[PDB]
Design a protein around this nucleic acid. Sequence first.
DNA 1: GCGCATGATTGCCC
DNA 2: GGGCAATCATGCGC
Length: 82
Amino acid sequence: MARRKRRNFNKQATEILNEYFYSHLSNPYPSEEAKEELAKKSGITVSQVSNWFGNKRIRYKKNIGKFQEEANIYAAKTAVTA
DNA sequence: GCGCATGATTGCCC
DNA sequence: GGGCAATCATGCGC
């Protein structure tokens, strides 16, 4: 296993969490039902979501314009699965 | 054969 | 307290 790096949020959680993340940027933290739906949808646990999300904003500040266009990309696909 | 891609561990933060 | 914030090992691939 080792210390850490990824392993947790699989490719499923990432696609899911980001899409929703780009909706609460100004609030880089899910909600009770959010961490529930997310964690259910993704395959993680509530607390992990708040963990994942927090990191998304950070990485954002690194390549702003990269996340902007993405934000629109993933945004339009928010009506997918629930 | 070492490193390049990605989040997790850790601490700060005004 | 919650959220934000680098820095690194971990993975997987180059």
